[PDB]
Design an enzyme around this catalytic site. Structure first.
Site, PDB file in Angstrom:
ATOM      1  N   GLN A  39       0.884  -1.165   0.000  1.00 29.99           N
ATOM      2  CA  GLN A  39       0.000   0.000   0.000  1.00 29.99           C
ATOM      3  C   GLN A  39       0.939   1.236   0.000  1.00 29.99           C
ATOM      4  O   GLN A  39       1.908   1.305   0.780  1.00 29.99           O
ATOM      5  CB  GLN A  39      -0.869  -0.005   1.244  1.00 29.99           C
ATOM      6  CG  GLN A  39      -2.075  -0.954   1.043  1.00 29.99           C
ATOM      7  CD  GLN A  39      -2.839  -1.332   2.299  1.00 29.99           C
ATOM      8  OE1 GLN A  39      -3.538  -2.351   2.311  1.00 29.99           O
ATOM      9  NE2 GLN A  39      -2.706  -0.534   3.361  1.00 29.99           N
ATOM     10  N   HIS A  79       0.407   4.994   0.125  1.00 30.61           N
ATOM     11  CA  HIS A  79      -0.767   5.692   0.488  1.00 30.61           C
ATOM     12  C   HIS A  79      -0.554   6.630   1.660  1.00 30.61           C
ATOM     13  O   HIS A  79       0.548   6.986   1.999  1.00 30.61           O
ATOM     14  CB  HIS A  79      -1.903   4.691   0.855  1.00 30.61           C
ATOM     15  CG  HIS A  79      -1.610   3.847   2.070  1.00 30.61           C
ATOM     16  ND1 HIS A  79      -2.591   3.387   2.923  1.00 30.61           N
ATOM     17  CD2 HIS A  79      -0.436   3.365   2.558  1.00 30.61           C
ATOM     18  CE1 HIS A  79      -2.034   2.669   3.885  1.00 30.61           C
ATOM     19  NE2 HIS A  79      -0.728   2.646   3.693  1.00 30.61           N
ATOM     20  N   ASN A  94      -4.640  -7.856   3.011  1.00 35.36           N
ATOM     21  CA  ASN A  94      -5.486  -7.619   4.175  1.00 35.36           C
ATOM     22  C   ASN A  94      -6.641  -8.660   4.127  1.00 35.36           C
ATOM     23  O   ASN A  94      -7.320  -8.775   3.100  1.00 35.36           O
ATOM     24  CB  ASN A  94      -6.075  -6.193   4.204  1.00 35.36           C
ATOM     25  CG  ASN A  94      -5.228  -5.172   3.460  1.00 35.36           C
ATOM     26  OD1 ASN A  94      -5.032  -5.299   2.271  1.00 35.36           O
ATOM     27  ND2 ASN A  94      -4.788  -4.134   4.156  1.00 35.36           N
ATOM     28  N   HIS A 149      -3.198  -8.509  11.479  1.00 42.21           N
ATOM     29  CA  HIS A 149      -3.755  -9.427  10.513  1.00 42.21           C
ATOM     30  C   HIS A 149      -3.595 -10.867  10.942  1.00 42.21           C
ATOM     31  O   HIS A 149      -3.413 -11.737  10.111  1.00 42.21           O
ATOM     32  CB  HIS A 149      -3.160  -9.213   9.128  1.00 42.21           C
ATOM     33  CG  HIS A 149      -3.597  -7.933   8.477  1.00 42.21           C
ATOM     34  ND1 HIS A 149      -3.041  -7.473   7.291  1.00 42.21           N
ATOM     35  CD2 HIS A 149      -4.515  -7.005   8.846  1.00 42.21           C
ATOM     36  CE1 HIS A 149      -3.563  -6.295   6.996  1.00 42.21           C
ATOM     37  NE2 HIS A 149      -4.447  -5.983   7.924  1.00 42.21           N
TER      38      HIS A 149
END
Ligand SMILES: *Cc1cc2c(cc1C)nc1c(=O)[nH]c(=O)nc-1n2C[C@H](O)[C@H](O)[C@H](O)COP(=O)(O)OP(=O)(O)OC[C@H]1O[C@@H](n2cnc3c(N)ncnc32)[C@H](O)[C@@H]1O
Ligand SMILES: *Cc1cc2c(cc1C)nc1c(=O)[nH]c(=O)nc-1n2C[C@H](O)[C@H](O)[C@H](O)COP(=O)(O)OP(=O)(O)OC[C@H]1O[C@@H](n2cnc3c(N)ncnc32)[C@H](O)[C@@H]1O
Lengths: 573, 573, 104, 52
Positions: free
Chosen positions: B403, B405, B548, B503
């Protein structure tokens, strides 16, 4: 069309709601923030089972809802960027900083909270009364009368908040501290529990009061209130009240529905601003009171010349202590101990009712149980023993407020190394002389996140009494805290950043006479000249005070609400 | 008596609610936490006007609701206490630490969230699909069939979450990054927007999805659902499911109402546990599945021997970059500029539709407007330009999720010195081989804040592929992030504390055959041997995954709910 | 201005410097080991009254400098260690090592 | 800096700080073993840590 409108859903706003919805007015209240406290609207966020089992974590909830008022342009040097990365040639306006603000005359710690229930959703719930020296006069030349009125108002305010002084009476740590301090200052100072807006529900759960406690903020009519009329509108930014040409009455409240983006106007008979000390002043200056922009004495305001001047904020000193060996041994002074912990012959016993017992049986029983059930634990204090909540109130010979306690809002990454049961927080709060040159003002060019005039401070703690008292205060905390134990490393005695304490006052100050007392509102909290505009909040308080101001502001709102009920007639239902 | 009971109100629980309340079951759901997300029950806390205007502050909301799973006994030396203060002779059990936990084999970053809506009240809303390499088989020996089923399940899951891939398509920063990366890896890797459970409402407001989005959690029957039956019970700790003597069916769910303190039992036909990867396992082990206490191989469990073994958690690497000078200049490559900023002759112009324009007119218009309206600002990127949201999905040649971001959950006191518009976050997530020796277990002596068996980890990233891939992952982040700019000082490339990534998977893992696949539940998420007990959540996922996991867990719940509807009959209404 | 206040420590038999018979230091000599705590009693009370004195007296001159707040330094940083081969008239009566001519 | 450069600590206890953000590939301790000239005889809680 409403009878009354209120801007802000904090506990001062809710004081107005409670009084006025109960008197039968058609009330509307708007808040720029949103409902986010679970099903009890405007309640304390601390009142969940999970937070009182992990109280350490609530600091993060408070931090998450304190948005800094004025942040100066940043001048930190970063000269280890990679050569390839874009690099500044100047310290230009970045990340919402305020270029009007001088970093050296700021209240850098001042912040605001935009949620329904306002700061009362996270506050520490201490609600002391001010003694004469800290309080504005409500009655001239009749001290005993002025005393009675305040006693009357505060007594009601304590009802609304559910203020009590015995919620921690069962705590070993609390009493350990309280008793030692009383003993040490014998006949020079008095100690007691901090008066707290709180109701204990059980030995491990305290229902902390808030705006909800004052008024439940449910829309009305409803079943438990079928003849009352109240609507709350969250996610509405209120921007301007509209003056008539005569500057004798407000004609409308101008709003911005944040969710639809649309603007409207709202008519009421009675307008109440309770948006907090900063945002009341912003709303007013946005509306043509006071002066917009950098203070310019060569252009006086037309209205409310003292608006945004004479602001006060309190000096705050802080440390934490580790409980002395002496005090800890005293907890278990009544215990006879045989054997060595961890063997089945080990025994901790006490003789109930024994004349030479320094503690009550309940205390001894707790200690005995803890020591027998947890023979691996080196301290006599039970794991779930509630926190200390001690104070010696402001006096002339010690003109500062004191809290000797445990606060959810700690000021640094918290310790895990030292046992929590040994730790006490020390917060002493000084009074600040109000001065004309100390100002909150609003930029005529820079705007904040809601496109309103950007708030700017020009503040320094006054030379004179304020500075001397603050330093004598620091010294007092050192002297008094030593009685209980040494400083905790990482929480050494220090002044907190200006305004972090969040007791800002005097921004729309109250007095008898607008010119003589340099003020904005009269003792009914009515804006001078205006029939139907009222201000509520700490902004009203014109005096130099050290104690926590909210209960005082509430008392003023109650008296304001007497006036409204005696002067305006509710519409028929 | 209910038809179905669900433990936990997270989005996996809510998947079961949505499916089963909609199929006409009498449903009850209990959550140990409370409603605290405003009037939309279980919604995203990020969805207030105030947070998206001050997004920096949301880190504090997340921190406030992450309670660490297992904290080892503290051994930090404090030797600057005052001589008078009580001082430890040992590092004894203080402040809720877990004496069973080895600090060197922990998932120190693992935490849980006890609120209604669970972690979906604060999550980052990234919902990628797993490719075959990351996903458990739902159909043996028929890859194209297994593909179709997952495509069917994920497509529904994306509906429930409102997953989309174009919400940021209008962002200059997002496209700047996306386009450069595509360009740089031309025909070796593909980039796209991170699939996000989110709906844009306006140019400055994104309605982030959550549990509420899946199912609104309002009690039923109600007006918009007059033939449905659902009750939610917050502030209820669920402690044990009761097995029949045959270990073929669950007979009751045992609960603790936290507010009254009373315990009850609850009968349903169908029991669903969705309390999260840690608390499902705790509930089960508290109920006689698996093994209580320190693993002892010389006493095998009677039931579900693989419960709490083979746990996986992902390696996470992180940095932040400052955007390169080259990229920043490119933003304004289509602009002709005359004069010098700040004079009234200054002009930034572009030719719409011009063939040699590298950017669309909308981009150019934004840039022109910003540069003309803010001539004091040295960057061509508009102040309100939305954040980047870029990914290259896991592949065999790059077996990590990425990611690229801006995440609300930053890992340190945040910068104010470098302009926010230049900053990009980089998070690469590795897959972890499931191993039997990696375990979550529950103490038979130590208990947690809710008086349940204390959770304890025994974990290390497996030697072998897992370790090699993690290091090649770190190196990839370094190599790829350099294409966009240099590292931001204070956010240098680093592995995050184990489990911070949240996770965790494999704690009650799914498979075809309990012994052959070392698992706990079958592909309908049913607990082996048991007719009426189902597990939902990331705990189910038995594979080594980098992306994810939530959308995957949701898809599994959907398939679980097909089974229930085909096998149990709702009561009459 | 810097403020350093230094307290006196009661000598006690249980406070010891000793040398390992297994562990050796960088010069291959017996490794030094401390077993020390500031004595309860006067030493502890005086140290805390000392801290308080520094607070009271330093305020006369100005406020604390942020980053140098009042604090106890790590034990021994002060480098005034004494009593390790102590002097007295009589070896047994005064529990000592050397006489007033500093002779062993 | 001159003073710091010539003060060698007398007794440094075995170190127990937890470093759990090493890369998976890097050699990692299973115990707090005697490292970097620390003195295993020294109790960290009864030391003159500042003596040099
Ligand atoms: C944050 C805090 C505060 C605090 C405290 C410790 C902390 C960490 N401890 C307290 C102590 O123990 N006791 C003491 O007396 N006070 C304590 N405080 C302070 C306390 O919370 C405040 O003094 C009190 O809340 C003031 O109440 P009031 O109702 O005057 O103000 P408010 O809570 O700030 O709410 C005002 C609201 O109005 C809104 N708003 C702002 N601008 C607008 C506009 N333009 N339009 C519509 N609404 C507006 C807000 O969102 C808010 O809710
Ligand atoms: C915190 C977080 C999580 C997160 C994320 C970033 C952060 C900062 N980013 C996400 C990403 O972009 N996408 C991804 O797929 N996941 C992301 N996550 C993770 C996500 O929030 C979780 O994977 C997901 O929420 C798991 O859902 P599930 O419904 O399985 O679990 P839950 O949310 O933890 O809720 C379980 C609940 O049950 C309760 N509870 C726990 N024990 C009990 C007992 N004993 N009795 C009754 N109720 C119980 C909880 O309180 C909770 O609500």
């Amino acid at each position: 069309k409403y009878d009354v409108v209120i801007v802000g859903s904090g506990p001062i706003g809710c004081t107005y709601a409670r009084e006025l919805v109960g008197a039968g007015y058609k009330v509307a209240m708007f808040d720029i923030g949103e409902i986010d406290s679970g099903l009890k609207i405007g309640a304390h966020k601390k009142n969940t089972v999970e937070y009182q089992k992990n109280i350490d974590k609530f600091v993060n909830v408070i931090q998450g809802q304190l948005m800094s008022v004025s942040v100066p342009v940043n001048t930190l040097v970063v000269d280890t960027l990679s050569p390839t990365s874009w690099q500044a040639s100047t310290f230009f306006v970045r990340n919402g900083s305020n270029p009007e603000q001088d970093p050296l005359r700021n209240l850098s710690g001042q912040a605001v909270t935009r949620v329904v229930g306002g700061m009362s959703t996270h506050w520490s719930c201490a609600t002391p009364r001010f003694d004469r020296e800290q309080r504005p006069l409500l009655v001239k030349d009749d001290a005993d009368a002025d005393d009675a009125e305040w006693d009357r108002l505060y007594t009601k305010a304590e009802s609304y908040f559910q203020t009590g002084t015995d919620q921690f009476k069962e705590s070993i740590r609390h009493n350990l501290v309280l008793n030692k301090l009383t003993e040490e200052y014998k006949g020079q100072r008095d100690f007691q529990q901090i008066p707290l807006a709180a109701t204990r529900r059980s030995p491990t759960f305290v229902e902390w009061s808030s705006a909800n406690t004052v008024f439940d903020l449910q829309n009305r009519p409803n079943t438990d209130a079928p003849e009352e009329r109240f609507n709350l509108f969250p996610a509405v930014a209120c921007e301007r009240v509209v003056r008539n040409a005569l500057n004798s009455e407000i004609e409308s409240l101008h709003i911005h529905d944040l969710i639809s983006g649309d603007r409207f106007e709202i008519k009421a008979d009675v307008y109440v601003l309770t948006a907090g000390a900063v945002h009341n002043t912003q709303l007013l200056v946005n509306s043509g009171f006071g002066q917009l922009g950098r203070p310019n004495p060569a252009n006086p305001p037309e209205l409310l010349p003292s608006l945004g001047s004479y602001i006060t904020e309190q000096s705050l000193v802080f440390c934490q202590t580790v409980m002395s060996t002496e005090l800890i041994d005293s907890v278990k002074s009544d215990m006879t101990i045989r054997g060595t912990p961890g063997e089945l012959t080990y025994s901790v016993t006490y003789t109930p009712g024994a004349s030479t017992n320094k503690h009550p049986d309940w205390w001894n029983e707790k200690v005995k149980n803890h020591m027998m059930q947890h023979q691996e634990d080196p301290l006599p204090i039970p794991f779930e023993d509630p926190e200390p909540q001690v104070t010696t109130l402001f006096q002339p010979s010690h003109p500062w407020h004191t809290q000797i306690h445990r606060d959810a809002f700690s000021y640094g990454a918290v310790q895990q190394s030292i046992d929590s049961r040994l730790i006490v927080d020390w917060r002493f709060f000084g009074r600040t002389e109000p001065k004309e040159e100390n100002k909150l003002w609003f930029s005529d060019k820079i705007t904040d996140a809601y496109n309103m005039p950007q708030p700017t401070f020009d503040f320094r703690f006054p030379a004179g009494r304020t500075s001397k008292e603050a330093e004598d205060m620091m010294t007092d905390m050192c002297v008094m805290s030593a009685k209980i134990g040494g400083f905790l490393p990482g929480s050494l005695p220090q002044f907190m950043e200006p305004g972090l304490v969040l007791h800002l006052g005097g921004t729309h100050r109250m007095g008898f006479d607008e010119k003589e007392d340099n003020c904005c509102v009269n003792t009914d909290s009515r804006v001078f000249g205006f029939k139907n505009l009222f201000l509520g909040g700490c902004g009203n308080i014109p005096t130099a005070y050290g104690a926590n101001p909210t209960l005082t502001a509430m008392s003023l709102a109650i008296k304001s609400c007497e006036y409204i009920k005696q002067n305006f007639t509710p519409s028929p239902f």
